Design a protein around this ligand. Sequence first.
Ligand code: PLX
Lengths: 121, 174, 104, 347, 140, 169, 97, 114
Amino acid sequence: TMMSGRPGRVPLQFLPNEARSLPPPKLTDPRLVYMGFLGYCSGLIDNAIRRRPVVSAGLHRQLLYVTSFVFFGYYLLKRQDYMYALRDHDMFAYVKSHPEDFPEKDKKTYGEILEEFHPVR
Amino acid sequence: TMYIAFILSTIFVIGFVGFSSKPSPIYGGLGLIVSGGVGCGIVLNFGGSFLGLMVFLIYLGGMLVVFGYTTAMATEMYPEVWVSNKTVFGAFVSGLMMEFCMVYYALKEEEVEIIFKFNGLGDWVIYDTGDSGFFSEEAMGIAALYSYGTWLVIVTGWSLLIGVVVIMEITRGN
Amino acid sequence: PFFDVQKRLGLDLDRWMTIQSAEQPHKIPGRCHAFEKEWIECAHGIGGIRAEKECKIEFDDFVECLLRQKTMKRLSAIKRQRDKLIKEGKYTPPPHHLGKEDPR
Amino acid sequence: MNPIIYTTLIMTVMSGTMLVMISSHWLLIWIGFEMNLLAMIPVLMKNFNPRATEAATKYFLTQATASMMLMMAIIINLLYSGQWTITKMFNPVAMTMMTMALAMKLGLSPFHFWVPEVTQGISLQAGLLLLTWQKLAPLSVLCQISQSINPNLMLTMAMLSILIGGWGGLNQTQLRKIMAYSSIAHMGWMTAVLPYNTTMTILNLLIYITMTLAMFMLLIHSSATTTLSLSHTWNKMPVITSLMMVTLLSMGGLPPLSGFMPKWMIIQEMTKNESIIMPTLMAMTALLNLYFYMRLAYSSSLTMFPSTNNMKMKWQFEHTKQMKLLPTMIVLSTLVLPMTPALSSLN
Amino acid sequence: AKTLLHKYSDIPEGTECHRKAYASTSIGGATGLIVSAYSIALKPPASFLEGVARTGRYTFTSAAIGAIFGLTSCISAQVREKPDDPLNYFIGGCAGGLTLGARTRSYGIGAAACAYMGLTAALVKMGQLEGWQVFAEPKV
Amino acid sequence: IVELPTLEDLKVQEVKVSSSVLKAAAHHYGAQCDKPNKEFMLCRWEEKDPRRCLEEGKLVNQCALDFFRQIKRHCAEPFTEYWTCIDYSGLQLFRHCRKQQAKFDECVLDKLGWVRPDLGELSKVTKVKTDRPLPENPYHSRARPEPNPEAEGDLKPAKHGSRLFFWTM
Amino acid sequence: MPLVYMNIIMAFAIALAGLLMYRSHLMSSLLCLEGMMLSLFIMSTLIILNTHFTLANMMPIILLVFAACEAALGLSLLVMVSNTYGTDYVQNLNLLQ
Amino acid sequence: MNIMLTLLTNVTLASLLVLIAFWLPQLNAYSEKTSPYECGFDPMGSARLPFSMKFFLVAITFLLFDLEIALLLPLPWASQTNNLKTMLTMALFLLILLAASLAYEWTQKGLEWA
Ligand SMILES: CCCCCCCCCCCCCCCCC[C@@H](O)O[C@H](CO[C@H](O)CCCCCCCCCCCCCCC)COP(=O)(O)OCC[N+](C)(C)C
């Protein structure tokens, strides 16, 4: 399953205190504003399905939708960055854990190496 | 020894041979009666007596009666006996030869090759010392259900209750 | 999604019924409590995967504790051996009338 | 049946699945399915038809035998390891049966034959609920026993579910049977990747549920059923047919659309495992799955089947009893593609 | 059983054509019994003698296909003596369809069966050469 | 290959009093014989192997023998008058006889002079000194395999994050 | 594993094959299913009696309950199907296997 | 053993009574004498379908109470558990639901018996 079952950590909490230290996404992270428009269009279809005079009507509820999805979108972004930062951390710790299996291979240059040439004909 | 528990297992299995073959539900009800008493006997041999008497009571004293009601609702004229059709009787014989092959394998005394190995010999061999004070393991073992296992009691209560509700919401619809 | 809410809330409402040991009424021992106890003490931070390697021996002894499989194949081999000797050997006289009844 | 009882049933179904998602002990899982069943049958019997009755007969009969095989295989597991915790199973002859039992519970082929039929026998409400909520619990346990699965056995049903989920989909007219073959086809994609990486499964699951919520809310909104019945809707409330088109394409997984996100993560995962051929056959057949979504699109929005006259009076009357959750279920099931990475939230 | 395919797998190369051909005949027979089994299961024959007629049909056909495939393949191996390239199976593949073409008494189905069965077999050999995993282990 | 004690070394003359007779006076037997007894069982539950404590298992036998030797010279006729009353019931219930216990308990409390324990007394757990070591590892067992490291540092932000496919950030 | 267990397991296999050979009026199937139930019960109880795994002495009865419970439900459906026909499996309205 | 012996002697006893019941009077059976009784006049048809919802509508409720009493049985032994307050609620609990189940039937007019 990976990550799940990792030592330490507790099950249902949405977001570890071990996070927090990661910077929060900034207010106008483009992904986030995209959550905005996602909510926007949902709010619009909400009108169009129920006839309605689309756009101008219910501008109220439309604002509710966009605030909704941008709101949830925020925390969801926080957990996103937390998770990726997490796998990066575990990965590096593991590469220190087994230096032998992750050799620091010597880097021969092009002059040093031969390679077959295939003429175009 | 007597192998009595094992021969009971054999009568059990043929109880399912005549039962799993499908010759009017009533005779199958007989099949589960025979297999039922044989069952409670077999589990009685290890001394889990309370359970064997649960099944001999709760099951056979309950179920097969209510099946003795379904047939009143189903029946159809000229119900078939086991002998009354070539596929039914053919099926019963079909069970008998197989189980008999198993008993022949018991005569072979070799570990069974089918599916996975059956270690063979008499049943007694697996027993261990049953030493205890003035109480059977079973007694407090099931008595534990209330004090020490409330959760199951909750879900069983809830389940049976809403099962009654379901019976309502099926039969009332008509 | 193995939600483990029962763990986070600590309700333990299910966990007790698990395992051969784990406190049983009137402290009645499991028939195979020991091999099980060792085998679980072997099992923690090793977690699942490496556990099927390193703890194999313990689980094995626990298996034979459960089924008595091998001791039965042996004991069967002896009892079947004895038939060959049945004419060549007379076994033991006491079984029939030895000190085993004096023994207690 | 008055709402106060109906809601208790449906809530005890929710409980009857939540219980599977909580308990670690096996016996509580088999109890989870078992309670789920009893509470699932009656809700299929609302309105009640001579047809619906034998629908429920099908469903019960298969679910009962499935639960039976499952409990048997649990008991055999216990016999050969004396445990109750989920974890690895310790005896392949048992393990394959737990896989079979669950294979019926998902309705994967060749166990699948009940699902297209049962769907036919019930209203789109009970139908939708059957094709979404019932798909949770058995998957909820498969994710827990992904560790020891015998991948051969899993990929074979996982593929055959896609072929049968295809060929049986080209043939039918009335939509409910088609929705049945759609779902029976997606389950092939879920259960395929399961041995390799469960998080992709759960992702695909979420998309599937969102999708089929979109469709069934739409069919409810138009009360269409047989394909022709759907055909008339273009004139009355053009929007919703003009939206069935899209959600159908998202079923089809045309790449800008959200429904492409499942396949395109799946292909990734399996490709890390090598196993390069299997996803190619799978992805090729998924096309065949698409085609009847397209034909169904032709009956509906893209082209106008002749209207019946009687429709005209119906034009005066707005639809009512709006279903709040719907618009979001459309939008999430479509536009969300540049939000794949968020999948890692599922870790 | 896997032991049977394992039996067929130890060709070696193509030596002793009969030894191989018997095994391919065995596999073809197995698949024939399975197809017959589901066919009887899902198309209730009515009058059981007709059912055994059916199973005799499929079993004999698939067994035949396996036989002729196996021996043409090994013979080609023992004649061209190339003998390792995938095309070495392909003839047999092409041959196999014709066998199927004969029982069906139709040029069409025989013609198509030639081509596709041929390509499938060729891919199989190519796969033995390349260790293609079809059902790869979780590894990841 | 398992180690075993010789057939002889275990051998000890048995207590051979019948169980009813045994029970009739055992209520005192717990009260008097004791130190070897609790030493024994504590020795047993320590290391579980019986062979280890078998010798104390001899010592308790002989101790009980001395107990009855103390009995027979004094109370006996009252004693037999008692257990004969008890053995008559197949439930072995104490309630059925009782009155004789007046005879027996009095003849002992005078002629050999020491009290019967009250009903609430024997059950309580007893403190017991002992010189022999408590066993190292009674299960014997093996090594505990080395736990996976719980290594940690702190979380620097992901190197480019969400590195999958075309996504930049 | 001792032969007796093998025998009960086989009784299960027959208690399934009987359910699936499946013929005529379906009441036979509810029987065969209950037989299956009983075999699982017995096979469980013998085990819990074996290892003195005492807590699990509670399970078989609980098993029994729900299992019996679903069967108790099953008859009701049969009633309904019996209600319109006088039961037989041979008559099914639904199309496409 | 003990019990199996008494079972065998009882059943053999009864079977003995059967055999001395048939192979004894030694007289003439014949048709119409052997025809089924129907209070004189011949039956209008062999027994068929005395159908009633009012059978199962309650009989099923029997079955689901009998399963309940099956859970009631452990009670006498459970009473001696070390921790009754943990138990006692449940001891009451099921009975409430038993009653509750009945109560639900009592007034949905599902209990028309007969
Ligand atoms: C009647 C009609 C039928 C209705 C049926 C539909 C029901 C849908 C239910 C969907 C289930 C979602 C799960 C949400 C529960 C919240 C609990 C949450 O906190 O769980 C935590 C974990 O956090 C969750 O992962 C948060 C999930 C949030 C859901 C959305 C995530 C991003 C969606 C990706 C797709 C892109 C769409 C995004 C657009 C907004 C703790 O779990 P953990 O102990 O750690 O691990 C469990 C094991 N797992 C990972 C295998 C499951």
